[PDB]
Every structure is written in structure tokens, then in C-alpha cells.
């Protein structure tokens, strides 16, 4: 509406655009690592609810699609283990969960696509290795789109700013001219 | 066909098997159940000069100490190190 208001929004959406881009780049590297680790994890995999996701949002419909234990801080806050997702999952993570004790996880397909004794720890591990590959791809995807949406909003807001900037000057001048005439 | 993998590495996509129980595989495995192992390694990477140090350290905590099932964890570590 007013130049000061747009000024603050513009600085805000400019920062977001940059952060979303950097977050896309971190997730791209995290996915690159995860997809490499998923290869030997699948061949190993071949041979109560409770719900598998992570602590971190900004990954689209990863948490919502999978949503009394739940691995991931998002699972319990929406509906217990914390500190998952940030560091790639290990078999030790699966053991911790199994020791504290269907299985609901996001299965990796591609960068865009994903779908919802000792072998007990194997199944938890399988779900973990698939989940993070899906989560890192989905975050990379969502942040790419967010950074694009931020870009288009920066342009739209900059145009509104400049039309308002010009209109303010023109209006002030017309009031001055009218008073003088 | 025969499949042999750890959660991180694939080795194969007669097999001598220790029963799992820490020991040598001839086509070193830690444990597990296609042969599935929590840690499967060479054989080139293992030392072995430090496993003796690990065995003696585990036998030091055994003469602790004391409280049951602590203890049982120490003995398992002694069994893995002896192999």
C-alpha cells in the first residue's frame, strides 16, 4: 500500500529468496549423498503404527502424508524421537528405535516423485534410508519453487513500489500547482 | 545366487558362515542373519594390533563392576574382540 510498508516487505522477500536458494543447494548436496547411500541400502533391504519422517519442515507433503512413538519431531507436534533428518540415518538409529520398543514411510521414486528380531531393525533402517532420500529431494524441490515464487513476488512488489513512487510525486505536484493557480 | 551386504556396502549381489556370531566369512562379519550383517569388512582394513588393545580394555571393565547386564554388555564385547 504505502512505500515504507512495501520497503520492508521487499527487504524481507529478498532475504527469503536468497535463503530458499541456499536451502535448495544444501538439500541438493544432501540428496546427492542420500541417493548414493540408497543403492546398497536397497539390496540390503530386500531380505503398533508408528510413523517415519523428520524434525525439519519446508519439504512439502512429507510430514502431512505420513501423519504411540513416531520418529521425527514433526510427527508428535502434528499428532517419540528427536534429532532426525539433519544427519543421514544409520543402522544405529534403527537400533535405538527398536531397543526402545505396518511401517509408514515415504518411498523414493525420483527427484519429483515419492509415495507412502534383527529383521525388525532391518525394516526400520529400510524405511529410514528411503525416507531421507525422499525428504531431501522434496525439500530441494519445494525450495527451488519457493525461490522462484519469491523472485516473481520481488518483481511484482518492485513494480508496485515504483508505480506508487511515481504516483506520490505526481500527486504532490498537482496539489502544489492547484494551490498556485 | 548369493547376496552379501552390510547396511552400507555390497560385496556380492559354498559360503562358510559363523553362527550370527562375530567371525570370518569365506565365500569378517559382526552379527545379523542372502547373508545380512551389521558390519561386514576386510580383512585388509582391520587392525588387529588395536583389537588386542580392545580385548584387554574389555577384560578390564569386566573385573569392575559388578551390576548385572552391564557387564553382560562387556562380555559380548569380549566375544566380538576374541574373534
Amino acid at each position: 500500500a504505502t512505500l515504507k510498508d512495501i520497503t520492508r516487505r521487499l527487504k524481507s522477500i529478498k532475504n527469503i529468496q536468497k535463503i530458499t536458494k541456499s536451502m535448495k543447494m544444501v538439500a541438493a548436496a544432501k540428496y546427492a549423498r542420500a541417493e548414493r547411500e540408497l543403492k546398497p541400502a536397497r539390496v540390503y533391504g530386500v531380505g503398533l503404527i508408528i510413523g517415519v519422517s523428520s524434525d525439519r519442515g519446508l519439504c512439502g507433503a512429507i510430514h502431512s502424508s505420513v501423519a504411540i512413538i513416531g520418529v521425527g519431531d514433526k510427527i508428535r507436534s502434528i499428532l517419540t524421537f528427536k534429532e532426525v533428518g539433519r544427519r543421514p540415518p544409520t543402522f544405529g538409529d534403527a537400533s535405538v528405535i527398536a531397543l526402545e520398543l505396518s511401517i509408514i514411510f515415504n518411498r523414493f521414486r525420483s527427484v519429483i516423485s515419492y509415495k507412502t528380531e534383527y529383521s525388525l531393525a532391518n525394516i526400520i533402517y529400510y524405511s529410514l534410508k528411503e525416507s531421507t532420500t525422499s525428504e531431501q529431494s522434496a525439500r530441494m524441490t519445494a525450495m527451488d519453487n519457493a525461490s522462484k515464487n519469491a523472485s516473481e513476488m520481488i518483481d511484482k512488489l518492485t513494480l508496485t513500489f515504483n508505480r506508487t513512487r511515481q504516483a506520490v510525486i505526481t500527486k504532490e505536484l498537482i496539489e502544489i500547482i492547484s494551490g498556485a493557480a | 545366487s548369493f547376496t552379501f551386504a552390510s547396511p552400507t556396502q555390497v560385496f556380492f549381489n559354498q559360503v562358510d558362515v559363523p553362527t550370527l556370531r562375530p567371525g570370518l566369512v569365506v565365500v569378517f562379519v559382526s552379527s545379523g542373519s542372502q547373508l545380512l550383517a551389521e558390519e561386514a569388512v576386510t580383512l585388509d582394513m582391520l587392525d588387529l594390533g588395536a583389537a588386542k588393545a580392545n580385548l584387554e580394555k574389555a577384560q578390564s571393565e569386566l573385573l569392575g563392576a559388578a551390576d548385572e547386564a552391564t557387564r553382560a554388555e562387556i562380555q559380548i564385547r569380549i566375544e566380538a574382540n576374541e574373534a
Binding site: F91, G92, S95, A98, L99, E117, Y118, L120, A121 | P22, F28, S30, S31, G32, E38, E39, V41, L46, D47, L48, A50, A51, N54, E68, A69, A72, E73, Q75, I76, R77, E79, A80, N81
Partner: peptide
């Protein structure tokens, strides 16, 4: 019955200890 399975314990803890002992060597 195995000694570790008396007061406790699971085979998951067994494997967890054995796997770590391999890494530490």
C-alpha cells in the same frame, strides 16, 4: 538360554555391541 538374555537383553543390543567392536578395530 544365552547369558545376555537373562537380566535383559535383546539381540539388537548384541548386534549393536558386536558391530561397534568391529569398527573400533
Amino acid at each position: 538360554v544365552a547369558y545376555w538374555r537373562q537380566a535383559g537383553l535383546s539381540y539388537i543390543r548384541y548386534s549393536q555391541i558386536c558391530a561397534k567392536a568391529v569398527r573400533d578395530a
